Symmetry: D3
Subunit: 267 residues, 6 copies
Amino acid sequence: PVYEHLLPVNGAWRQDVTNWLSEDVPSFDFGGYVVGSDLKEANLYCKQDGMLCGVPFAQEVFNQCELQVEWLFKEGSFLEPSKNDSGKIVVAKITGPAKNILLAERTALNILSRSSGIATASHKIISLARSTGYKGTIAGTRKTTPGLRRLEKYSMLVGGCDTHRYDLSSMVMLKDNHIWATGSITNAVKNARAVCGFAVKIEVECLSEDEATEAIEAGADVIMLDNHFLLECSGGLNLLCDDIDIYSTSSIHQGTPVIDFSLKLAH
Amino acid sequence: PVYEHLLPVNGAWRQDVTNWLSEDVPSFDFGGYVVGSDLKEANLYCKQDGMLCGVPFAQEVFNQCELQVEWLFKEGSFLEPSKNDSGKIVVAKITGPAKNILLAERTALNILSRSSGIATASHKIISLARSTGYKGTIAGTRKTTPGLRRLEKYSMLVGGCDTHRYDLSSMVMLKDNHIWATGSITNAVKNARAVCGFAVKIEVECLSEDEATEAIEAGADVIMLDNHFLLECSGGLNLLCDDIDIYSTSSIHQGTPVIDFSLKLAH
Amino acid sequence: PVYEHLLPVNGAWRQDVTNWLSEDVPSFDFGGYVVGSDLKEANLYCKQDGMLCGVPFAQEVFNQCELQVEWLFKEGSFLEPSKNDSGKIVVAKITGPAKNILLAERTALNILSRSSGIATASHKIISLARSTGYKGTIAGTRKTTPGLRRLEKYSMLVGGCDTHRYDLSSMVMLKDNHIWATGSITNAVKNARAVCGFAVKIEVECLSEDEATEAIEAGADVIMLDNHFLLECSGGLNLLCDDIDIYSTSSIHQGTPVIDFSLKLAH
Amino acid sequence: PVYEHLLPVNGAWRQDVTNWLSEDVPSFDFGGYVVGSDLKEANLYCKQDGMLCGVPFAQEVFNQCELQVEWLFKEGSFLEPSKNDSGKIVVAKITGPAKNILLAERTALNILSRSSGIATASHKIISLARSTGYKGTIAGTRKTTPGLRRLEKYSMLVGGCDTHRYDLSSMVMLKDNHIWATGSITNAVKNARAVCGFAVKIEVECLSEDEATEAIEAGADVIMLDNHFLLECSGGLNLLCDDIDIYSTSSIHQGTPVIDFSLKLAH
Amino acid sequence: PVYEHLLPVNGAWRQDVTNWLSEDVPSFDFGGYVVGSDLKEANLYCKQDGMLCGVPFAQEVFNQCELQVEWLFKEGSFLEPSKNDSGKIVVAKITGPAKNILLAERTALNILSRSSGIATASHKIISLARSTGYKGTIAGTRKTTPGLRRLEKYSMLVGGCDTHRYDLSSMVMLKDNHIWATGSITNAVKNARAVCGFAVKIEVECLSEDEATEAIEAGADVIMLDNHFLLECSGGLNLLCDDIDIYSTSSIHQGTPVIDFSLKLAH
Amino acid sequence: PVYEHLLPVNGAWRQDVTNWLSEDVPSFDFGGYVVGSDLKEANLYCKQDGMLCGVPFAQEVFNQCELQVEWLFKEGSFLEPSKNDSGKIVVAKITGPAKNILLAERTALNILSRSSGIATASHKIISLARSTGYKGTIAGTRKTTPGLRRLEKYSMLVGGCDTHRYDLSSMVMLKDNHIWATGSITNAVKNARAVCGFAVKIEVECLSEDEATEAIEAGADVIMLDNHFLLECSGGLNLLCDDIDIYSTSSIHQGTPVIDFSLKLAH
Ligand SMILES: O=C(O)c1ccccc1C(=O)O
Ligand SMILES: O=C(O)c1ccccc1C(=O)O
Ligand SMILES: O=C(O)c1ccccc1C(=O)O
Ligand SMILES: O=C(O)c1ccccc1C(=O)O
Ligand SMILES: O=C(O)c1ccccc1C(=O)O
Ligand SMILES: O=C(O)c1ccccc1C(=O)O
């Protein structure tokens, strides 16, 4: 199975790429005027160790900029530029009008660097959490970059982690606020179940068995314990995991370092 | 002078907020349905030391969700949640319908956490270079998060750094590419000048004082070097600061850690 | 609990209303020009028996046209315009500039008529199956009107039916296609699970208890048949209701009759 | 002449198709991930008697999903699946990546089923109204589905009826409200004529000859009688038509039943 | 009757204003940052003789920038900044935050200057033809500024001219092309009528009374000639006005001079 | 260097063209229905003396309308139709479906006529201002047509003039308002420099040397004198230029006459 097949042949994600280009060229591209449209060739280099992610998104940038791209690595490949190659590894070869290449450059790399960065941070964490014997799952959160949720969630998947619920319409998540308001957790879950129906899971954030009792009771599919159903623990920082089904943490995607890339024309 | 005044009373940045809300509620807000619309109070907490930023953007989120907000610190205030008596500082008091607070919560926090992160990274870096006699200035780059350029460049400013050119339409930045293409740094600058006009500057990435001077006479406004005019050094990070007018780095905005925030109802 | 609370205070659904107004006034509103802006009163009448629905959507239309509205019945009220003394029931009192009322009129009525239609069809069908001992539940499908999914699924809910998965991102629904492709119901479910994660369910359309069980063990959350887990029957309409957890049909929302409404000024 | 030539080679109607796809895939298409991109072949079946409509719109769905379509029937063709063929008739053959076919499926059928449904209801009515000897015209209304006016009006045309005015900017339509406000029908029409000019027709809703007098008087092009100019009668229910030029009725498009379709991959 | 009532309370024209503000502030408004938000007063001056137009559009700009405006003249007032005591007439008093006034200034002026220009050119031309016994009417064309059709056609109306058909969907206008294609003016009109229906007119560009009459009998509503029905002459400009129902010219709206305006703070 | 290379291979300017087409065809294109899709050929004529401008924009109209265009003149070419050729000169040959040609016609010409019109007015002015011995620069303003700034600024460049700052985010421009508010011009420029940074120029509108003193003082890059730095004079009307670096005037783009064009199918 190929991860890039998660993206619909057409949809709003492609218009996003268009909007990212417009963000970079509000009026005219002066540099492209001087460099002209002569056919050039360029190398796209990875300059740091990590997992390659965000290929389909970057590919869409190149398509709209009408360039031809030859990827030398599949998405998900671990790159090690430090051994040494002048510090870099070419992961793609670009061909097309000079101005088009230089126009597509910044946006494409800004995509790859962050996407690869999240996959690398994602993989590092689950790998590290799984090396302790913990066979549960490591998940993200909804603490994504505004307007970039599609790409960031996608990067979590390639990094090997669970994306968790995508948004507020995906899985009901009731925490203390919701419960106080409906009153009973069995009522909170009752109402939640009334609208979300059977096709969506309901998770409840509990403190004591009491809550996690009526919660399991009412029919909640997931119980979060904070401090025929699943258990979750939100926080995951360091050193330990203990047979809980899910440990959620924004560390795999929010505020993670980026994986540097560069693009240089042949001559 | 107030930074938020940099943002136009109306414009695309506000629709951005709207699209960020849509990103999180593609269809229904089940949690909002259970929680209902009773008036509530909530505290917005800063959970980590750093410079507060993203206030007007978080405020626009609160406005669209029809809430009332009381900010306790001006934007740019160096927060220090050190007192551990809680390790948090209430940065704002929020009031409104229960479902509205919970709907605005994630989106607003994702804004504040990242904006404050960048403001912080930008401030600790410009001061870090300030504590070495360097009296020039630190600048950003175009390596910003796709679709979030306006917010990130805004953070850099509050952070104390120079944002540098905003996009591919805000300066001309010519490299070897544009010089090889035009024939000479003078031909490239002549061309760039032919389109950008007197109102916009032109920067040339010279790699020799020999050419740098023909660039300086070609009409350039800024001269760059890297591994009647300004001078810049572009690249990496440590130790090294000659008296160059500007030093740019994506370190003040790209791949920076975020500043933890949270929101809790009074109950 | 109030259904309209399912809709976010702000989001794409409100721009939808705006685009619906544009659809009706591409350029000028001549009738509005003749009628002017004198304050007027109007009665919104229900002309046929059925469950009232589409109130928050009609209300958003009235808000954008800057009108004041007084609703006489809660959403979901079974209206019966039988008294013929008029055969109509005033469902709302509207006041505002004459041109504003007439501009909002068609759009708001088209909303109410269709939303009430679906709520009605959905209610008479779920009860129709309820009066045969069946205590499971009736669900909708993805066979919704293009661009009107949010409104139609909303109607189903008020109507008393389960809306079923919202889109191609809200459950995984695997068929022979996905099984042939992956090799086994278990391979398909393993793959679906690899991307949707723990937060979202997976339904497999088994056509044999032999496989249905490998689907049930593969990790499925729902098992479908058609001409620790739930069970569904998908298809047609009459007479027949075994104790299957769910029965889906596009009959509750697609091709349903509408519920006649009208609006008249006081004069 | 070909009906599909009414749609501009490019325009907002194509972006609508894109928006309908996004409505179905807010985030990821999990099913498409498992089924992969293997080239498949599929049959598009009509499962109910009626007129085939909405071809260009469905074709646009397939283009954006990058599929190849072979239509075995021209738009407007009467299909009779009941005789018998296993109940179905293949009207199109689809070829393309498996995931693309399955992605395009739901939206394309949701289009065809409703479009064909309106054309069939439209044709049935005029045919039935014309079999009484009435040689006038049968027209629709503005009681269309919000956001789907282009397709629904189009379906009326293929069904053989008149679409009537497209929107509030097409033809002025003054009913009692408008007249009371300008005062005289000759004034109401006077003002209306002042802005709409000569390129657009003015229709007035009358009660007594008096109104339909000054109406014809002032220069109204169409007179609606409700209960060098044209006459209209809005309501048309059943059994009779009497030499009036136009009988308008929402029965040909609003709340009509749908014509079922299905799509199944070859193997 | 008030012209501004031609514009719907809400619709795409208001988003247009918003996009016009974005066009002018792609990122930040530095000038707004220096000037701050102190309440100020300003005078909007008309600097050249002509008919005032574009008031509701300028007002929408002032609304979005959260300002209060006091208009001194009704739209359509023939302004004459002749008194030279100043050569200007205060057309409106504006109050609000300093940055808001300065942000709204250019956009609002560009609106007023062009709208007033067209209203003026349209008025001096229709009267110019009026002072030659001609009692028919002057009309516009489709040769409008891209993206500004609504504003320009609006100006024509206030200017006193007929706007003519609004777009390619508001009349059918058939030429030799459509006749050659269909075979006869009658076949073309029959086809046009088959799709536009009774509600919309059909104009045929006849170049012979011989055909003009078959067009007139084919069902045409308007007959055009150029270098139970109306008659039009399309083309140029001078001296010549037979008793033809309509004379169209792009002179009343395309390539017209603008009417100078300015805005100044009280200080 | 080619001017059309200033436009990004993809960006919002292409969506604008799409929006201009939709503005012309809100619903159906009746004329295109009758004329059908037969392959035709057409000539695009220039009917007035002037400079050809707006080629890339017009080309984009033809691409979206799927036509093939053969340009017989490069953008910037001076056309002289008066000598005589029947008054016209073919500058492009169009080939494609009849309906597509007729659909693209109006929008393409509305573009060319205005663009060529601005370039011609632009060239005429600088040429005339440069024939006096003045070797400074002639610039435009921000008094552009709302929503058409990209094309109008572009036309100024081809006409030979300077576009001046593109928008409110391009170059800071402080006039009396701004100065009064910050107080000192050295403070006004100080604050301005605080946010705009080094990459953007600051221009100050002065009255007396005093202002133009502290202005040069604080570090203002351009001084406008109204009545290592540049001088500007805004107003330029007629007869004289005196060794100032820049004379700005909206005369080169606002309210300029248009250069007529026409398109006629071969037969
Ligand atoms: O963002 C959060 O608060 C969050 C935190 C942990 C897991 C899941 C979520 C979620 O909301 O989906
Ligand atoms: O984006 C970059 O690579 C960049 C890096 C350093 C300074 C400026 C820029 C810029 O292009 O604006
Ligand atoms: O859309 C369908 O064909 C469908 C039919 C019945 C249940 C669910 C669905 C669904 O796909 O969500
Ligand atoms: O929708 C209506 O009220 C209506 C009803 C009958 C004919 C035409 C119309 C119309 O408005 O165009
Ligand atoms: O656009 C034109 O060429 C035109 C010219 C004169 C009248 C009407 C029109 C029109 O097409 O609407
Ligand atoms: O539009 C103006 O006021 C203006 C006038 C002259 C030069 C420049 C400008 C500008 O704002 O950019």
